[PDB]
Amino acid sequence: GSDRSRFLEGKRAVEDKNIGPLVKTIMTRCIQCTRCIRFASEIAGVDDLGTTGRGNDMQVGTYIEKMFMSELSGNIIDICPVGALTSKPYAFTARPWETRKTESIDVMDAVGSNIVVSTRTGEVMRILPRMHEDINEEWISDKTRFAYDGLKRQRLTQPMIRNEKGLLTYTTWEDALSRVAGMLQSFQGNDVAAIAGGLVDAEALVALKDLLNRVDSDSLCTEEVFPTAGAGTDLRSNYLLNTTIAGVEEADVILLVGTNPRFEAPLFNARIRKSWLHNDLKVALIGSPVD
């Protein structure tokens, strides 16, 4: 690129737009590369972005005011090469040269999306998508991205006990572990149980399983239900997506039963989006008709 301009005339200016509380539009910065449009109508499947007008004053907007609804809307931020489309929550919060990037995964969806966690001064600002092909590929769904502030909402940071009246009052570790220990050595078997949550680490799952077993108990329940009858958890293929989503493109006809993947596994649908677009997949789902 050059080091100066021969430009001495004026620059065109276009008004902003409001298509979301996440995407922020400074459309004077737009270079009309049409990446958002092709992303919207080929990856997210929503045909609402476009370039209205011609000549030079045309705008890559939406004409009629719109509310960008796609669950892959957050990736529109990472594809625009300029600051024309930007993440509203992260806007004016950090600059790239100070954000230490750590590669991690997602837990919001059961795809384990490879993501980049931006960290600065003991806190996280914005979440970026990594690349692994079978996992999230190059895009992540919205709530995977705009969830950092959740870590800044209600936080459990101290041990808790019921006080003399019951009221939850902050306490040291000693009282917390002493309280559990007294009722842990007592009681046995089905008396001591465990219910698994949504975001539970495999390291913690083993630790609970060992702890519950060392006190002679097997009641480690889980949130969602899967019939133990027949084979249950015994056979690995019962509870596994054995087809390795990277192989869904290889498939020809998809049969989705009792699910809304566009809302449950957006990236899994995003694979179908890509696969069906190029590999000509034949989709068929029974259940409630949801887009």
Partner 1 sequence: VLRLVMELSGEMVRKCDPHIGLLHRGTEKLIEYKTYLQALPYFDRLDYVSMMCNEQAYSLAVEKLLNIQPPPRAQWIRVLFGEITRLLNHIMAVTTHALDIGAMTPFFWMFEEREKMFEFYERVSGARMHAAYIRPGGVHQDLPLGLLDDIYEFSKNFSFRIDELEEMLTNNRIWRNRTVDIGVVTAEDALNYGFSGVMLRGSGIQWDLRKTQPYDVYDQVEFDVPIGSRGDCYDRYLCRVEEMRQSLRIISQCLNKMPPGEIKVDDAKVSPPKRAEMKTSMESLIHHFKLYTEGYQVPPGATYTAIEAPKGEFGVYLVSDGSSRPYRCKIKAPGFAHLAGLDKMSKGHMLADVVAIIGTQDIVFGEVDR
Partner 2 sequence: TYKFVNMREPSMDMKSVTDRAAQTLLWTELVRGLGMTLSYLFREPATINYPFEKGPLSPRFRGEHALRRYPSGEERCIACKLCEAVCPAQAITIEAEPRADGSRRTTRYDIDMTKCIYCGFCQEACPVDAIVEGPNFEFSTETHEELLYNKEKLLNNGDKWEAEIAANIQADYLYR
Partner 3 sequence: TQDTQLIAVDEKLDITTLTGVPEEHIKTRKVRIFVPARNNMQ
Binding site for ligand SF4 (CB under 6 A): 29-36, 60, 80, 82-85
* Partner in contact with 185, chosen from ligand SF4, K ion, partner 1, none, beta carbon below 5 to 8 Å by kind: none
Q: Residue 92 interacts with partner 1 (CB under 8 A)? A: no
- In the region spanning residues 136 to 155, those forming contacts with partner 2, defined by CB under 8 A, are none
Least distance (Å) from partner 3 to the CB of residue 128?
Answer: 5
Q: Residue 248 interacts with partner 3 (CB under 8 A)? A: no
Say if CB 130 and CB 102 are below 8 A apart. no
* Partner in contact with 93, chosen from partner 1, partner 2, K ion, none, beta carbon below 5 to 8 Å by kind: partner 2
- Establish whether 80 is an annotated binding residue: yes
Say if CB 140 and CB 266 are below 8 A apart. no
- Establish whether 232 is an annotated binding residue: no
- Which tokens go with 23? 């995407």
- Establish whether 33 is an annotated binding residue: yes
- Which tokens go with 116? 């980049």
Binding characters for partner 3, 253-272, by CB under 8 A (x = yes): --------------------
Alpha helices in 186-215 (DSSP H): 202-214
Q: Which stretch binds partner 3 (CB under 8 A): 19-27, 128-136, 189-197, 234-242?
A: 128-136
- Establish whether 221 is an annotated binding residue: no
Spatial strand order of the sheet with 124-129 comes to 100-105, 114-119, 124-129
Say if CB 123 and CB 152 are below 8 A apart. yes
Q: Residue 4 interacts with partner 1 (CB under 8 A)? A: yes
What 3-state class would DSSP assign to 125? strand
Q: Residue 47 interacts with partner 2 (CB under 8 A)? A: no
Q: How far apart are CA 40 and CA 46, in angstroms?
A: 5
Q: Residue 201 interacts with partner 1 (CB under 8 A)? A: no
For residue 179, give the nearest of 168, 190, 199, 189 by alpha carbon.
168
* Partner in contact with 130, chosen from partner 1, K ion, partner 3, none, beta carbon below 5 to 8 Å by kind: partner 3
- In the region spanning residues 93 to 122, those forming contacts with partner 2, defined by CB under 8 A, are 93, 95, 97-98, 121
- Which tokens go with 276? 């069906």
For residue 224, give the nearest of 193, 266, 196 by alpha carbon.
196
The residue ranges that bind partner 2 (CB under 8 A) are 91-93, 95, 97-98, 121
